[PDB]
């Protein structure tokens, strides 16, 4: 037979692998990644000023951030209008930024009693219980009064440094570059990030009105209790405007087909394990299918839930007079990126599950390394002939064609002729003999004798692979 047990399961597995590959390929954001890289280059590599040498990646003092906010950060981001937000007139930032400072409360530690005559107090690391809540210095408004974590749309994250919650002083930027610079100068003059601070952060959004990509950019700085601070930045490309045109329709159709295939596979594999041999886990073939189905279902559900609501972007675009709570959206985007990495791992697992015909993994390298040798040997003859013809054309048609003018251009001309972009108007006109002869001989020796030798080599390689497999695998 081998038509229902050896021609369907393998074909279905191959189709599932193809669908997974298509779904993975339809998840690479090129423009968003380029925009994030450009923003990081204009921000992370931005120094303090023209004469200062304090960059985002070189945080060494409490005045590095203050000097950075007025300078290159005001040139690559706070560019004047033609006060809009467009440095090269093409990077349109979305909304306005916001600043937060999770500082240690006044008296966040204790001094020794034996040395109480000289030691006053200390400050601990950033944490939920180590975040200031009362005023810190002159607090006219919210510039030095910490906002509640629940009341300021903040929560613990537990990043690379500590679990900085939403507690801490909060402030909002302005709608003008000059006003933002003035506010930054006012905050730097006063005690905003004092010695009793533990962490700082800033959150902005980028729209780039020419490109449909609204992302968030969050910079952070961990001020350790042992002096100094370490800054960093992170870009979250979270968007929910995917449904645009025929490409979006194709992506949605592929997603629906993948969901239907997963449902069909679950239906087909949920009957032969219930009314049949159960508890099969260490079989390398029964647990793998169940794990793959469960992982696919979980990933599909997580992806669907990540885009449950799309009203955040619409609300931000309708009213852009403040900084929206984009931290939750950035966290969701980070979780989506982690899910995408997990889906790449699941695609690798599916490829492994497509290896049910094993033992053909490393016993054939000796033949591939011989086919490579044959191809390398062929490439020498092909290139010798090609350069001989190119030199002939360059010497004969050198001064009268505008196509065989320079030697570096004759090669491209012959390549285009090979691909089928022949002109043949000047070639015959520039020389009625040795013009047609060159073209005719070139075509005959490049499409009938030398291009058919490339195929014969691979034909022989395939035939010998088939022969040696059908010999050794079917002999012992």
């Amino acid at each position: 037979k081998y038509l229902k047990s050896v021609l369907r399961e393998l074909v279905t597995y191959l189709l599932f692998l193809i669908v997974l590959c298509i779904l993975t390929y339809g998840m690479m954001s090129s423009n968003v990644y380029y925009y994030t890289r450009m923003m990081s280059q204009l921000f992370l590599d931005t120094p303090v000023s023209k004469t200062e040498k304090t960059n985002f990646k070189t945080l060494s003092s409490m005045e590095d951030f203050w000097k950075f906010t007025e300078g290159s950060l005001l040139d690559g981001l706070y560019w004047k209008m033609q006060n809009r937000s467009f440095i090269f007139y093409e990077n349109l930032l979305l909304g306005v930024p916001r600043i937060r400072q999770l500082r240690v409360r006044n008296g966040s530690c204790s001094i020794p009693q034996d040395l109480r005559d000289e030691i006053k107090e200390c400050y601990d690391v950033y944490s939920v219980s180590s975040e200031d809540r009362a005023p810190f210095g002159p607090r006219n408004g919210t510039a030095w009064i910490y906002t509640s974590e629940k009341d300021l749309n903040g929560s613990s994250h537990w990043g690379i440094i500590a679990t900085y919650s939403g507690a801490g002083y909060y402030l909002d930027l302005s709608r003008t570059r000059e006003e933002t610079a003035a506010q930054v100068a006012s905050l730097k003059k006063n005690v905003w990030l004092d010695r009793g601070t533990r962490a700082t952060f800033i959150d902005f959004s980028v729209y780039n009105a020419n490109i449909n990509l609204f992302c968030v950019v969050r910079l952070l700085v961990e001020f350790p209790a042992t002096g100094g601070v370490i800054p960093s930045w992170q870009f979250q490309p979270l968007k929910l405007i995917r449904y645009v045109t025929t490409f979006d329709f194709f992506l949605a159709a592929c997603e629906i087909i993948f969901c239907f295939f997963i449902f069909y596979y679950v239906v087909e594999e949920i009957l032969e394990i219930r009314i049949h041999k159960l508890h099969y886990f260490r079989s390398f073939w029964n647990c793998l299918d169940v794990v793959i189905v469960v992982l696919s279902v979980v990933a599909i559900g997580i992806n669907i839930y990540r885009t449950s609501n799309v009203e955040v972007l619409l609300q931000f675009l309708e009213d852009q007079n403040t900084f929206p709570n984009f931290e939750h959206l950035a966290y969701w985007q980070i979780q989506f990126n982690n899910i995408a990495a997990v889906t790449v791992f699941f695609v690798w697992i599916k490829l492994f599950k497509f290896i049910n015909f094993n033992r053909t993994m490393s016993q054939l390298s000796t033949t591939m390394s011989r086919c490579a040798k044959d191809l390398f040997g062929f490439a020498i003859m092909f290139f010798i002939i090609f350069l001989a013809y190119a030199q002939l054309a360059y010497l004969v048609f050198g001064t009268q064609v505008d196509d065989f003018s320079t030697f570096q251009e004759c090669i491209f001309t012959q390549f285009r002729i090979i691909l089928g972009d022949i002109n043949f108007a000047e070639i015959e006109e520039a020389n009625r003999v040795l013009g047609p002869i060159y073209f005719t001989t070139f075509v005959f020796f490049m499409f009938f004798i030398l291009l058919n030798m490339f195929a014969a080599i691979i034909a022989d390689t395939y035939s010998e692979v088939k022969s040696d497999l059908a010999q050794q695998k079917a002999e012992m």
Binding site: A209, V244, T245, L317, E318
Partner: protein, 48 residues
């Protein structure tokens, strides 16, 4: 750079509905016969 769609009535010129309905009424879409599917938008049979 696109948003929602208008659905209300407006008088001669633009919005100033004085007596009843705007002289430029909405003319709600027909039950069947629409969806032109534009360059990068999808419309219906409704409109002024």
């Amino acid at each position: 750079a696109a948003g929602g769609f208008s659905t209300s009535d407006y008088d001669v010129g633009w919005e100033s509905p004085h007596n009843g309905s705007g002289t430029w009424a909405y003319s709600a879409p027909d039950l069947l016969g629409a969806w032109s599917w534009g360059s990068c938008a999808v419309y219906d049979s409704g409109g002024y």
